[PDB]
Amino acid sequence: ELAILKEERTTTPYLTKYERARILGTRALQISMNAPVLVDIEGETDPLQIAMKELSQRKIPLVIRRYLPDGSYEDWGCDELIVD
Amino acid sequence: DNNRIISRLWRSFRTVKEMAADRGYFISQEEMDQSLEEFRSKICDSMGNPQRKLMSFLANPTPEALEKYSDLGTLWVEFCDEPSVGIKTMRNFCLRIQEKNFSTGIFIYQNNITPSANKMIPTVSPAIIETFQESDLVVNITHHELVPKHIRLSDGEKSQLLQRYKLKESQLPRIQREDPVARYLGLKRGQVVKIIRRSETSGRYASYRICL
Amino acid sequence: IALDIEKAKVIQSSIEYTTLKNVTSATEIYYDPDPTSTVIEEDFDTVEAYFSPWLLRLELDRARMLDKQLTMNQVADKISEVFSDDLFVMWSEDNADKLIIRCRVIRDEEDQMLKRIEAHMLDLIALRGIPGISKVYMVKHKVSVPDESGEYKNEELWALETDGINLAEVMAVPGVDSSRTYSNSFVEILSVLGIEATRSSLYKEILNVIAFDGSYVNYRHMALLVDVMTSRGYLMAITRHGINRADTGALMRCSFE
Amino acid sequence: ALEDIMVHYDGTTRNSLGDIIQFLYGEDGLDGTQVERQTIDTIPGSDKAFHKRYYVDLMDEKNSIKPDVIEYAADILGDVELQKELNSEYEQLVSDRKFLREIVFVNGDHNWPLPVNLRRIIQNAQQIFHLDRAKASDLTIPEIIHGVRDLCKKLFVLRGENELIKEAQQNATSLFQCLVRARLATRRILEEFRLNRDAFEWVLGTIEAQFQRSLVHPGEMVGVI
Numbered sequence: 001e002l003a004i005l006k007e008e009r010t011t012t013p014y015l016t017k018y019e020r021a022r023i024l025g026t027r028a029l030q031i032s033m034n035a036p037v038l039v040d041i042e043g044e045t046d047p048l049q050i051a052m053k054e055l056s057q058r059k060i061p062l063v064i065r066r067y068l069p070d071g072s073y074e075d076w077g078c079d080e081l082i083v084d
Numbered sequence: 085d086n087n088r089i090i091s092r093l094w095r096s097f098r099t100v101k102e103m104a105a106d107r108g109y110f111i112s113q114e115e116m117d118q119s120l121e122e123f124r125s126k127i128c129d130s131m132g133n134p135q136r137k138l139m140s141f142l143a144n145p146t147p148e149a150l151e152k153y154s155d156l157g158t159l160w161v162e163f164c165d166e167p168s169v170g171i172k173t174m175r176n177f178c179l180r181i182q183e184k185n186f187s188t189g190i191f192i193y194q195n196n197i198t199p200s201a202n203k204m205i206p207t208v209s210p211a212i213i214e215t216f217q218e219s220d221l222v223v224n225i226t227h228h229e230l231v232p233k234h235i236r237l238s239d240g241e242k243s244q245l246l247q248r249y250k251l252k253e254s255q256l257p258r259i260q261r262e263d264p265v266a267r268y269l270g271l272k273r274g275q276v277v278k279i280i281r282r283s284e285t286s287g288r289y290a291s292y293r294i295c296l
Numbered sequence: 297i298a299l300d301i302e303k304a305k306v307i308q309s310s311i312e313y314t315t316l317k318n319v320t321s322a323t324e325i326y327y328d329p330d331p332t333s334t335v336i337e338e339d340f341d342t343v344e345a346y347f348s349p350w351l352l353r354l355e356l357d358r359a360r361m362l363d364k365q366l367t368m369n370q371v372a373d374k375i376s377e378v379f380s381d382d383l384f385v386m387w388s389e390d391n392a393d394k395l396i397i398r399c400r401v402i403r404d405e406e407d408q409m410l411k412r413i414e415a416h417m418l419d420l421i422a423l424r425g426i427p428g429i430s431k432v433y434m435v436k437h438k439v440s441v442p443d444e445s446g447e448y449k450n451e452e453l454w455a456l457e458t459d460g461i462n463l464a465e466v467m468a469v470p471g472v473d474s475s476r477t478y479s480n481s482f483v484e485i486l487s488v489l490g491i492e493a494t495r496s497s498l499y500k501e502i503l504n505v506i507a508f509d510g511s512y513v514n515y516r517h518m519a520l521l522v523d524v525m526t527s528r529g530y531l532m533a534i535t536r537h538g539i540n541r542a543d544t545g546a547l548m549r550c551s552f553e
Numbered sequence: 554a555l556e557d558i559m560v561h562y563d564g565t566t567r568n569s570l571g572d573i574i575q576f577l578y579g580e581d582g583l584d585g586t587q588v589e590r591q592t593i594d595t596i597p598g599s600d601k602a603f604h605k606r607y608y609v610d611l612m613d614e615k616n617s618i619k620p621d622v623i624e625y626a627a628d629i630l631g632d633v634e635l636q637k638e639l640n641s642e643y644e645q646l647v648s649d650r651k652f653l654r655e656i657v658f659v660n661g662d663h664n665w666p667l668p669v670n671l672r673r674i675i676q677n678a679q680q681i682f683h684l685d686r687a688k689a690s691d692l693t694i695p696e697i698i699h700g701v702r703d704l705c706k707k708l709f710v711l712r713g714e715n716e717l718i719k720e721a722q723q724n725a726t727s728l729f730q731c732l733v734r735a736r737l738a739t740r741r742i743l744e745e746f747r748l749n750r751d752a753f754e755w756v757l758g759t760i761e762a763q764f765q766r767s768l769v770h771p772g773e774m775v776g777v778i
Binding site: 010011012014016017018066067068069070074084 | 561562563565567571711712718765766770771
Binding site for chain 2: 563565567570571572573574576577579580581583652653656657658665666715717718720721724725726727728729731
């Protein structure tokens with residue numbers, strides 16, 4: 001009911017700074033909690049750097065639920081939001 | 085002083101005609117561009133005494149306003165002869181409005197109106213009566229540079245705005261009923277007006293205000 | 297009008313508020329035993345040519361009389377019409393050295409009511425002008441308007457700056473551009489013009505205050521402030537009397553005051 | 554007073570109750586840090602200067618594009634479709650001039666804060682593509698006109714097929730469209746700047762990307778700011 005169909009999404013297709021920071025923090029915490037990594041690890045040891053590398057390659061398995069003021073929400077995958 | 089009074093009366097009459105035209109009622113082109121000399125010739129007598137009863141007139145909505153707004157009826161504009169407004173004169177005007185099946189009527193006084201006259205103004209259903217001061221009608225406020233253009237939205241347009249913004253009626257910006265622009269447009273409760281405004285960041289801006 | 301200094305001066309004189317107290321220099325109460333003549337020889341010729349023994353005598357100031365561009369006929373007619381026929385008036389021309397206009401109570405001990413009438417004359421009597429306008433100044437405004445070729449050029453015009461606020465009456469004055477009259481009191485703008493004009497005037501005032509000293513603030517912040525202040529159709533003061541009256545949550549309202 | 558004001562994902566500015574304060578933040582939906590003082594070249598100058606700078610006449614040799622700056626100077630005289638396109642562009646420029654002078658800026662001021670510095674983009678393209686040596690440009694007039702027209706329609710602030718959304722988008726992007734049309738004029742591109750196909754495409758892409766990057770991010774606490 002409150003969900004919005006994928007073909008009717010009107011929000012911006014770009015990743016906001018707040019969304020980027022929240023995803024980076026969540027991914028860093030999850031990696032620090034022994035989560036599987038979807039990208040190769042060459043020399044980096046900081047979980048934040050691993051999360052940033054995953055974000056650059058668009059491999060973070062998270063979904064942003066943007067809330068409209070009325071109450072409805074739009075679900076955007078992290079693999080479909082444009083990252084600057 | 086007589087010439088000043090006549091000129092002020094003519095300006096007020098022109099403002100009332102412009103207000104009636106803006107509401108969607110049909111006003112003839114020759115009446116809109118009526119000159120001061122013609123007004124004094126057809127209204128003022130030999131002694132220069134104005135004839136307030138002769139200025140009262142009737143107007144009907146244009147077909148464009150008829151299709152745009154379905155709640156428009158006949159309009160009657162009456163000028164009070166005496167300066168004060170007693171309860172008896174208001175009762176007579178209300179009886180005339182009821183007997184002449186006028187949807188709306190504009191009453192204009194000179195000095196003031198009694199509170200007892202304003203006591204019984206909600207008792208004219210289904211008709212609507214509005215009270216105006218002649219001294220307040222000398223200058224058209226809508227021609228001011230600081231006052232942007234207001235356009236009353238239709239029911240369909242208001243609904244479309246509501247689903248476009250996913251809004252409730254109370255979540256829109258509000259405009260008071262006593263706002264002189266709202267009184268000029270004859271706004272009623274629950275009606276939304278669109279305002280086109282100049283903006284130094286984007287050129288044009290559109291706002292919406294719902295009447296209280 | 298703006299290109300002619302004489303017409304601007306005339307309209308400025310018309311706008312300015314002038315009362316009887318603004319021109320009266322002295323007042324006297326005299327006892328006149330004979331209505332046909334008078335004791336003083338200064339007005340003896342006047343009373344001889346122009347014709348309760350108490351009389352009211354007013355002496356004016358010549359420089360201030362000519363400053364307002366007023367004649368004796370105008371003020372005499374004003375004082376005659378303001379009291380109808382309840383007070384006989386005898387007015388002298390400019391030939392009289394003393395600027396005397398005498399008043400006599402209409403017959404139909406009278407010191408107290410006569411003094412009350414004199415106080416009424418001194419205080420409430422107004423000759424001409426919009427009330428509430430203490431002073432009017434002529435200001436030269438330089439504006440930019442395109443010429444025939446389209447290039448913007450500087451043009452000098454004459455405008456008025458008036459102390460005190462009276463919007464509708466000044467707008468109704470002939471010879472005044474009613475589509476451009478402005479007030480620094482946005483409450484009067486709301487009372488006269490509307491709410492959008494109030495928002496525009498509020499933004500203009502805030503911008504003037506901010507940029508008088510040369511500081512610059514982005515337009516969006518001031519626009520947001522003036523939109524919040526005028527969002528309910530009336531002015532919302534930034535205080536406990538405007539903020540706490542909103543329909544917001546009690547927890548956030550109690551945290552302020 | 555302005556504690557609980559945030560920009561939402563629909564572009565509106567609402568308080569904690571959901572009441573809309575502004576239908577678009579700043580009436581343009583742009584961040585405060587992404588605007589610089591730029592001049593709109595359409596507003597100032599006399600009518601003769603405007604006509605000389607912007608109007609292009611292909612019927613007359615003197616008023617046409619100089620033959621030494623374009624490689625297609627042969628098949629350009631006497632054309633009707635290109636002349637009609639140039640006439641439409643000139644009419645659009647005249648309409649923009651009228652709208653700017655008579656409605657928005659009546660005092661003649663032309664230097665205002667706007668997003669996306671176009672002069673920096675133009676000079677960066679000139680430096681990158683090495684537009685010296687007076688090389689004749691291979692950029693046709695219809696390509697310039699169609700590219701500018703497509704760019705002006707791709708400056709998305711509000712997305713949706715609703716008529717109100719389109720009207721709000723046009724109202725929000727009117728000023729930036731006027732500035733872009735003033736800068737990216739056919740005569741100015743062909744003579745003043747001397748761009749080619751690669752430079753023109755790079756400028757269009759950079760303008761679109763920078764305008765997309767200059768929007769205000771939803772969830773911004775604009776009231777406290």
